[PDB]
Design a binder for these strands. Structure first.
Ligand SMILES: [Mg+2]
Ligand SMILES: [Zn+2]
Ligand SMILES: [Zn+2]
Ligand SMILES: [Zn+2]
Lengths: 166, 97, 267, 171, 10, 87, 107, 543, 112
DNA sequence: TTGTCATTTTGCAGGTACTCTTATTCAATATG
RNA sequence: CCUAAGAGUAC
DNA sequence: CATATTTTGCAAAATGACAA
């Protein structure tokens, strides 16, 4: 309720104190509740590209890193206008640190991490970070301690590293 | 001229709500005052030219609203505050009808 | 004081009368849902008169001669006699009229016939008679089944509450029962065919206007009936053995344990 | 990290703007106002999803004013930095107090206090960089950094990061 | 009474 | 708000426009016309915004809806087009 | 129902509430000489069942407190043995319409 | 020019949540600590820093901006200060409530006396509304005068269950003026309950205990009924010849300083108690000067001081005198006269009144020409315009602007022009006991100094022409104009809902004439028949 | 029966001098006076002692005491009454204000 | 182990608008 | 300018 | 010589016993 000025804890991924508006369940615009899904770098980049191409098509009706950057710049200029410096920086950051290429690989990754039955924040971090070993991932992400077996995390990171291309 | 209580009652009986609001606000005294969503008090420092709104105590700067109330209403609320009463004004419902 | 007490009473879109807290004061405004400005004093014909006068006014028999109808009144006056279904219709209509007579005599113990009701049927009948030039000599084009079914459909069409459940339907019937009694009292088969001598188009026009005027007389949601009632009581007070007038009004509003003239009536 | 969230914005339209292209005006005015914006409640707001049919609803006329208040609901992609989160980035500048790393749309300033003692600033090289015993961190160099604090700023945000933990630095 | 002319009582 | 909105197929309010509804529609439309809102009807030379709104209402060319609020907070949406102006 | 002549000792009034669901109602014979329900001022009272009360609250979108109240000491409520929360339908011969139905919740 | 643009979102107040200031909230919202009773410094030309008119609370001079918000007196709401009281004092409006609360709570351990173990406490606590709960709890716990550290078991009155009681004996508390005196049962010992100890015992009441007493955990805790920090209202509340509130606040500061010095330098308990009583009296009379029994705090001129409660209550108080009803602009009042030649819904308006009262018409392509013509005519002749409101908020007075030349109107601007014929205007006669005594008429501008109205409309107004005055209000927007013409118009009021019959009729000369005209003896020759037929405006033209 | 007797008393008062008032006004008055289960008087100790909102209740009588009790009890006023909106200077939910006027984009496009 | 009955104190507010005129703002003793 | 008082107009 | 301070309408709530 109002609660006047209520105190709150400081956010920390170690404790997973993301926030009152970053809870696991969020009420969607349709009125029902959906799990808080988080996008990894490649998945977020694909989502951005899909949104931009859809916007470009709606306006119209009404791979290598260099060519990808040229295409995204041209499409950004054609679709939207100005004041997109933050968007341009995010887009180039995503293209530079692009862990995956197309829909098939990101879909396989997301379904694999869904099969892990783990927290969306943790699986998104695992998909984004390109870790190598298991203890390295555990020390990088404190939230993964005492949640999954060491061998299972190691092997799933092995498949993720195998799926890495370019 | 005095638009007394029972003139307001006659206008209510006529059902003309907007005319009553215009009589009580635009014709007499309309005051724009700023409040915050944390505490309903009017203790919001609003530097309009610099575009800076800040309620000290609540320590918020991004949760400010402006409302149009009669200056007599603002004076009544400030007098209640001076008399150790908090007439907190909120812009959303916390309870269902 | 009266205005402040009733200032927040309003008619809502479900026809209930509620205050600012949503408490139900009346489940329908004025117990009939009608705007006060659309109410006129009219006479209920069934409640008064004698039993013989009531039969002569309303009873119609197609198989006897004591209460038969003149065949010249309507076009098919020589074919209706000897019918069975039409006699059943007249039987149920007269039974309903008798039930209405008993009901009205129950409601008004003094037998007062003139009461304020929404739609003025008499003016509608006069307007139809003057508009369609009723010659009062030509046999009527109407059929009895037409009259009965038209009255029934008109009763079905007088809607005050638009809900679609048993509670709301019962409330609607309770709301329109008295006006339906008046309507059956006026648009009876004998009275239509003999006293007024409607035609088919004139009867349809009368039904349409009754329905339109009844729908137009329903109170509008959002009406501030509380302030209206407070003013309608207070203003006549300014024009003003047992205490009366302003002192009695003050004793009533200020509910006082001890009053000047406590009197009791024994029958 | 990047998320997608359900957001709502109130837009007031003048009476003069209720032509047949009102939907177009509302869609355009939602953009240029929230696209690429920044706030402390949701971090950065980068783009809007499902632009084909954004929920505009009906729109309420303000009494005595005539303007209409639409509560447009939409899906927005956001980037909210969080405490104790490891993220990749690129160094863009270095200074005496520390160095700035480009993470998405934000610049995280890692101070010289949050690095191992082997790494030291060096202004001799052009451009000045950070050089250690085993590796050197220069401009346009990939580096992984763990964010442990965030500072809300005007139309921007300057978080606090570190590389002191194991397996933090250039890849 | 009233007041005027509390209650009674109070 | 989805729970509040009574579905159109089972609205139980009067299909006739109330006097207050008509007054507010005429006032709102006149105020909008006074502020150069587009006109959806042809003008026969009339210049008063109120009578322009009256002409718009006469032939149901007002693109507004009434959100009738029930005492419990639920509401029904009635387009001006489908409301019957009998008064 | 206990029907007494003059009065009940208050030492017995305190033990009137027995173990539920058994309820004890006390009436004075002087108060029961004339049946109040036959008075023309007293309209018809019908107790509602739980399903009927639920339907009444559902159809009118009402809460418990928004209904008109009837005290749990009213002579008609004592006559019918109303318990708190139970709703009586009141049938009345109105003069604007023939029949009017009200509802009162016991408090 | 009004108020300039603000980027903050515009909403309407949906809920008003009441409560009490916590002292820490007062200290947080206050912008200055008031310490010096003086309002102006020794130079007598500027506001003293730290005085009662601190510039941080708002500017007392139109020439200077507020030191806090850097806004003029038009915009600045005024920002509160705070006075840190030397010792806690009772709030004069809560003393009775404080007595009830301390009579419901143990005066030593600070726990509610009758817990749920008592039979009647389940009934008391089951009550929903806070006020009824508190009434029941008080009327059952006022008679208990022992903390009852051990109580009979709820299951059976055989074994004893120990609760968190201390076993002390609660005193009987009365009020003697502005203080509470407690008499403990003699093992009576009478002593004045210090406000400090009552505050301490209030701060020890558990959350569950005082939430059953009606108090709120977030908005009103019982210990907040004791004043430790006084919120000082800004100068807008007490504009200057200082206001009564300023003098009372100066007295409060003087008493506070006296008590603080006495405590700091050491003094006999009698002097300390006297200073404390003086401070309590000053605070109480500042908030309420109409305390029964206690003498009124007189002003320097020997009259009672107008306290805040005096400002709020009464017919002329804030609520009834400035909020429920208030003086309004765009209103006229003058003597009324009858006119048989006016229509039922018409009202005759003197030309001077029509030249004074104005309506703002938005400049539109449909009315650019006539509005421009009215602007050209100016305010000195009727019809004409008095002001031109620009889209930027700047206002052009038609007087003194004829030198600048002709003004080019632009769409969206407003022309504030004289009310013309057929303008809907609300028309009233007071007291105005019913809605028909306040109706919408159409203006007809006439060349004499009285309002003119039809004879048939005098009955709903209860108006004669023996000196009656009537009031005229002009709507200032299209919405108000339209709803006034479509809801309050005179023809729509002919049939009153008061008695479902017409409220206007034929009266006075017309009634006598209509009786004399319709007699069987009355015959009219051709010439008079033609004149009478022509006098009927809608006569079809056939004899 | 008390409500019926109250209506009869008020009707007798009104019609003692021959004046006539429609039934529904007196019916509304006597229903308000008896809606709480007892005879609620039109006085400070009657209708003004409900939970109908502090701002509404203070506008009649005992203003400052009502405000003090509201502050101590932390009453929440939902501003559903006329007096609350009159004090706050906003359109009351009465008459023309008993509903919200909104814009249909689809109908507006459908016109042209 | 429970009713009884019989004196002494408990709070107050008065309709709606509107016009005009008149007086008065602590006096005086006391210290800087 | 405020306050108080008095006289008065229409109810 | 000038500013500062000394007519009206009651039902209860509360009280003092109390009685075995
Ligand atoms: Mg007169
Ligand atoms: Zn705040
Ligand atoms: Zn300021
Ligand atoms: Zn204790």
């Amino acid at each position: 309720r109002r609660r006047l000025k209520k105190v709150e804890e400081e956010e920390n991924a170690a404790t997973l104190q993301l926030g009152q508006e970053f809870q696991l369940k969020q009420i969607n615009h349709q009125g029902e509740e959906e799990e808080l899904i988080a996008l990894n770098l490649s998945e977020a980049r694909l989502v951005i590209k899909e949104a931009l191409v859809e916007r470009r098509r709606a306006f119209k009706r009404s791979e290598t890193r260099e060519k990808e950057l040229e295409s995204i710049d041209v499409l950004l200029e054609q679709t939207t206008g100005g004041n997109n410096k933050d968007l341009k920086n995010t887009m180039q950051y995503l293209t530079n640190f692009s862990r995956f290429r197309d829909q098939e690989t990101v879909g396989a990754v997301i379904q694999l991490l869904k099969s892990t039955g783990l927290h969306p924040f943790e699986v998104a971090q695992l998909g984004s970070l390109a870790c190598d070993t298991a203890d390295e991932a555990k020390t990088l992400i404190p939230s993964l301690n005492n949640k999954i077996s060491d061998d299972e995390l190691e092997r799933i990171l092995k498949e993720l590293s195998n799926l890495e291309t370019l | 001229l005095r638009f007394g209580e029972m003139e307001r009652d006659c206008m209510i009986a006529h059902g003309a709500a907007s005319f009553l609001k215009e009589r009580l606000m635009e014709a007499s005294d309309a005051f724009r005052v700023h409040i915050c969503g944390i505490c309903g008090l009017m203790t919001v420092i609003a530097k309009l030219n610099h575009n800076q709104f800040e309620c000290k105590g609540c320590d918020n700067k991004i949760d400010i609203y402006q409302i149009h109330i009669p200056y007599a209403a603002k004076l009544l609320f400030q007098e209640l505050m001076a008399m150790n009463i908090t007439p907190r004004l909120y812009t959303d419902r916390s309870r269902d009808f | 004081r009266l205005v402040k007490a009733l200032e927040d009473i309003m008619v809502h879109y479900d026809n209930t009368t509620r205050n600012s807290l949503g408490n139900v004061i009346q489940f329908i405004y004025g117990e009939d849902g009608m705007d006060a400005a659309h109410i006129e004093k009219q006479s209920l014909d069934t409640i008064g008169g004698s039993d013989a006068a009531f039969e002569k006014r309303y009873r119609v028999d197609l198989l006897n001669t004591d209460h038969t109808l003149d065949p010249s009144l309507l076009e098919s006056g020589s074919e209706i006699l000897g019918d069975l279904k039409l006699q059943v219709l007249l039987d149920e209509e007269y039974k309903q009229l008798v039930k209405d007579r008993k009901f009205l005599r129950e409601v008004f113990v003094d037998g007062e016939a003139n009461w304020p009701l929404p739609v003025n049927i008499r003016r509608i009948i006069q307007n139809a008679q003057q508009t369609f030039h009723i010659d009062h000599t030509k046999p009527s084009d109407l059929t009895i089944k037409d009259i009965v079914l038209g009255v029934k459909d008109l009763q079905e069409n007088l809607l005050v509450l638009r809900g679609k459940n048993e509670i709301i339907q019962n409330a609607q019937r309770d709301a329109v029962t008295l006006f339906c009694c008046l309507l059956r009292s006026r648009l009876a088969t004998r009275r239509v065919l003999q006293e007024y001598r409607l035609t088919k188009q004139a009867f349809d026009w009368v039904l349409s206007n009754i329905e339109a005027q009844f729908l137009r007389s329903v109170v509008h949601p959002g009406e501030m009936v509380g302030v209206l009632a407070a003013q309608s009581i207070g203003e006549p007070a300014t024009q003003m053995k047992v205490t009366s007038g302003v002192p009695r009004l003050k004793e009533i509003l200020n509910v006082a344990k001890n009053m000047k003239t406590p009197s009791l009536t024994v029958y | 990290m990047f998320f997608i969230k359900d957001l709502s914005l109130n837009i007031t339209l003048h009476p003069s703007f209720f032509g047949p292209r009102m939907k177009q005006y509302l869609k355009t005015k939602l953009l240029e106002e929230v696209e690429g914006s920044c706030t402390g409640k949701f971090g950065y707001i980068l783009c809007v999803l499902d632009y084909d049919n954004i929920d505009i609803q009906r729109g309420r006329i303000l009494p005595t004013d005539g303007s209409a208040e639409f509560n447009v609901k939409y899906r927005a992609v956001v980037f909210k930095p969080f405490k104790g989160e490891v993220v990749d980035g690129t160094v863009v500048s270095c200074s005496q107090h520390g160095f700035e790393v480009q993470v998405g749309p934000m610049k995280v300033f890692v101070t010289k206090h949050l690095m191992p003692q082997d790494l030291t600033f060096n202004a001799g090289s052009n451009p000045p960089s950070y050089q250690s015993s085993e590796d050197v961190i220069t401009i346009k160099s990939r580096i992984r950094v763990k964010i442990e604090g965030c500072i809300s700023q005007v139309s921007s945000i300057h978080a606090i990061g570190s590389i002191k933990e194991d397996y933090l630095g250039a890849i | 009474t009233x007041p005027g002319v509390t209650x009674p009582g109070v | 708000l989805k729970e509040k909105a009574i579905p159109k197929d089972q609205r139980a309010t009067t299909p006739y426009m109330t006097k207050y509804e008509r007054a507010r529609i005429l006032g709102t439309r006149a105020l909008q016309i006074s502020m150069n809102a587009p006109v959806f009807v042809d003008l026969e030379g009339e210049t008063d915004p109120l009578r322009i709104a009256m002409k718009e209402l006469a032939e149901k060319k007002i693109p507004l809806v009434i959100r009738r609020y029930l005492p419990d907070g639920s509401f029904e949406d009635w387009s001006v087009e489908e409301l019957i102006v009998d008064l | 129902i206990f029907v007494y002549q003059n009065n009940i000792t208050p030492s017995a009034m305190k033990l009137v509430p027995s173990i539920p669901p058994a309820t004890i109602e006390t009436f004075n014979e002087a108060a029961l000489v004339v049946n109040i329900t036959h008075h023309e001022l007293v309209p018809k009272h019908i107790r509602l069942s739980s399903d009927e009360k639920r339907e009444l609250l559902k159809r009118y979108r009402l809460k418990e407190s928004q209904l008109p109240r009837i005290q749990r000491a009213d002579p008609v409520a004592l006559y019918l043995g109303l318990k708190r929360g139970e709703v009586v339908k009141i049938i009345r011969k109105s003069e604007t319409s023939g029949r009017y139905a009200s509802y009162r919740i016991c408090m | 020019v009004g108020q300039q643009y603000s980027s903050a979102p515009l909403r309407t107040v949906k809920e008003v949540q009441f409560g009490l200031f916590s002292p820490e909230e007062v200290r947080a919202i206050s912008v200055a600590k008031i310490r010096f009773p003086e309002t102006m410094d020794e130079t007598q030309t500027r506001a003293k820093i730290g005085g009662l008119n601190d510039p941080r609370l708002g500017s007392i001079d139109r020439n200077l901006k507020c030191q806090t918000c850097q806004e003029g007196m038009n915009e600045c709401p005024g920002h509160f200060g705070h006075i840190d009281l030397a010792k806690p004092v009772f709030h004069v409006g809560f003393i009775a409530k404080i007595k009830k609360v301390c009579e419901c709570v143990c005066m030593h351990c600070g726990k509610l006396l009758l817990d749920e173990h008592n039979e009647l406490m389940r009934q008391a606590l089951a009550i929903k509304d806070s006020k009824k709960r508190f009434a029941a709890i008080w009327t059952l716990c006022k008679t208990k005068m022992v903390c009852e550290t051990d109580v009979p078991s709820e299951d059976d009155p055989t074994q004893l269950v120990s609760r968190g009681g201390c076993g002390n004996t609660q005193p009987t508390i009365r009020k003697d003026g502005l203080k509470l005196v407690g008499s403990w049962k003699k093992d009576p010992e009478l002593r004045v309950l210090s406000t400090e100890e009552i505050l301490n015992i209030f701060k020890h009441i558990s959350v569950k205990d005082f939430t059953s007493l009606g108090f709120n955990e977030v908005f009103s805790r019982p210990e907040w009924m004791i004043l430790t920090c006084l919120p000082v209202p800004p100068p807008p509340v007490r504009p200057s010849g200082e206001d009564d509130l300023t003098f009372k606040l100066a007295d409060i500061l003087k008493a506070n300083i006296s008590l603080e010095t006495l405590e700091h330098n050491g003094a006999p308990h009698h002097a300390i108690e006297e200073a404390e009583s003086l401070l309590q009296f000053h605070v109480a009379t500042y908030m309420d000067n109409d305390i029964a029994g206690q003498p009124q705090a007189l002003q320097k001129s020997g009259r009672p001081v107008k306290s805040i409660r005096a400002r709020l209550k009464g017919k002329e108080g804030r609520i009834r005198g400035n909020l429920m009803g208030k003086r309004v602009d765009f209103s006229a009042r003058t003597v009324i006269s009858g006119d048989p030649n006016l229509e039922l819904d018409q009202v005759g308006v003197p030309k001077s009144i029509a030249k004074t009262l104005t309506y703002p018409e938005v400049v539109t392509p449909y009315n650019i020409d006539r509005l421009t013509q009215l602007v050209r005519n100016g305010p000195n002749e009727h019809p004409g315009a008095k002001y031109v409101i620009r889209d930027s908020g700047d206002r052009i007075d038609l007087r003194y602007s004829k030198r600048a030349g002709d003004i080019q109107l632009q769409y969206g601007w407003k022309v504030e022009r004289h009310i013309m014929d057929n303008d809907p205007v609300l028309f009233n006669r007071q007291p105005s006991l019913h809605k028909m005594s306040m109706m919408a008429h159409r203006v007809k501008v006439i060349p004499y100094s009285t309002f003119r109205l039809n004879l048939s409309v005098t009955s709903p107004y209860n108006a004669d022409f023996d000196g009656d005055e009537m009031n005229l209000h002009v709507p200032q927007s299209e919405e108000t104009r339209a709803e006034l013409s479509q809801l309050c118009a005179v023809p729509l009021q002919i049939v009153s809902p008061q008695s479902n019959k017409p409220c206007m009729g034929i009266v006075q000369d017309t009634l006598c004439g209509i009786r004399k005209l319709t007699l069987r003896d009355t015959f009219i020759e051709l010439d008079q028949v033609l004149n009478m037929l022509y006098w009927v405006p809608d006569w079809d033209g056939v004899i | 029966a008390g409500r019926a007797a109250l209506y009869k008393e008020v009707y007798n008062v009104i019609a003692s001098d021959g004046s006539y008032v429609n039934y529904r006004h007196m019916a509304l008055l006597v229903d308000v006076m008896t809606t709480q289960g007892g005879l609620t008087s039109v006085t400070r100790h009657g209708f003004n002692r409900s939970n109908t909102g502090a701002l509404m209740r203070c506008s009649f009588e005992e203003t400052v005491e009502i405000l003090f009790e509201a502050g101590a009890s932390a009453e929440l006023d939902d501003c559903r009454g006329v007096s609350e909106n009159v004090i706050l200077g906003q359109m009351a939910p009465i008459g023309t204000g008993a509903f919200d006027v909104m814009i249909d984009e689809e109908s507006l496009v459908k016109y042209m």
